[PDB]
Amino acid sequence: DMHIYELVSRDRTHPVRIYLLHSEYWTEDEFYNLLLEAFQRSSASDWHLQILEVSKYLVTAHGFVEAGGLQEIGFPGELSKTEVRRRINAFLGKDR
Amino acid sequence: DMHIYELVSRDRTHPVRIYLLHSEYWTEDEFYNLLLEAFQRSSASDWHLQILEVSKYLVTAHGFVEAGGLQEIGFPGELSKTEVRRRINAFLG
């Protein structure tokens, strides 16, 4: 039962999202503490670059594996199966 | 490599997020088609129940694996390594 750890570099037009996987659960505090650890062997760059370094350290030092990305599909819970199917068909066009 | 597929059921009080992992990459369209595929087998329920049926179908029929959840930390891209450290500490204490 794997767990997902995301690191975000916030930006107006060029945000960075890194999704890491681990087989174990890390509490939020443990998670933050991991970044402090990374902060010791990495350069003093700004976050948009530092995020890359922290990711590299979690992977090498603690067994996180980087995922290729995340795709999402959402609907209101109240939405009938017919309207869901409606919305999906409209989205798919001829790729059905 | 490994890819994440998240199904969301939006609600006023009990939103539900389900995170699925797969070894293989599926386009959004293919992911949508997977839902239609599951719809062939599933009940006539509203989405808040349907989502659970779709998840189970993706898992048992398509080799998707459910993840336990998702945790996230974010900072402004422009933020210095110095201030990042300070926020982390502020949060921890």
Side-chain angles (χ1 to χ4, degrees):
Chain A
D1 189 45
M2 289 200 107
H3 295 266
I4 305 175
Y5 297 84
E6 184 186 12
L7 297 165
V8 177
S9 172
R10 298 175 195 140
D11 192 275
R12 312 169 169 189
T13 65
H14 289 162
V16 183
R17 281 172 188 271
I18 312 270
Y19 297 95
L20 304 184
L21 275 13
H22 203 288
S23 64
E24 289 212 278
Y25 169 69
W26 300 79
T27 81
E28 198 78 357
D29 284 352
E30 282 175 327
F31 189 20
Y32 275 90
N33 277 296
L34 284 179
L35 307 202
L36 297 174
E37 280 183 45
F39 279 1
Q40 305 183 19
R41 39 236 98 189
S42 140
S43 79
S45 60
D46 298 326
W47 185 242
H48 73 97
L49 298 174
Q50 174 85 196
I51 189 172
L52 298 180
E53 309 205 39
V54 172
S55 177
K56 281 187 63 184
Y57 172 81
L58 296 185
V59 163
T60 294
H62 287 285
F64 290 85
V65 305
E66 183 177 12
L70 182 158
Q71 298 157 260
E72 193 217 283
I73 286 178
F75 301 104
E78 70 177 289
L79 211 62
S80 75
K81 180 182 182 169
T82 283
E83 284 302 341
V84 171
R85 187 195 298 273
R86 255 256 170 194
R87 295 182 174 192
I88 290 175
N89 291 320
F91 193 94
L92 286 182
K94 292 146 98 74
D95 199 353
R96 273 157 57 196
Chain B
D1 214 20
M2 197 97 142
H3 299 269
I4 310 156
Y5 296 87
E6 185 193 2
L7 295 160
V8 182
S9 172
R10 295 191 285 276
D11 197 56
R12 272 188 203 81
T13 39
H14 317 112
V16 163
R17 300 174 173 265
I18 304 297
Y19 299 90
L20 300 179
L21 304 184
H22 204 286
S23 303
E24 313 286 54
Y25 167 81
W26 308 75
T27 59
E28 273 298 273
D29 279 356
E30 285 173 326
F31 187 13
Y32 276 121
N33 272 319
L34 283 183
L35 272 51
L36 296 189
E37 214 184 288
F39 280 6
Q40 303 177 6
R41 285 87 170 168
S42 62
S43 86
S45 305
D46 292 336
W47 179 244
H48 70 275
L49 299 173
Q50 191 70 210
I51 190 172
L52 300 190
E53 301 183 43
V54 167
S55 185
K56 296 168 183 174
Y57 175 77
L58 294 188
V59 173
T60 67
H62 283 280
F64 279 84
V65 170
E66 186 158 8
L70 178 155
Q71 286 159 276
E72 171 266 331
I73 299 166
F75 304 99
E78 92 217 73
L79 200 52
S80 84
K81 176 190 189 172
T82 296
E83 293 302 336
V84 172
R85 193 189 277 278
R86 285 211 164 187
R87 291 183 183 194
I88 290 176
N89 294 321
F91 180 88
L92 294 172

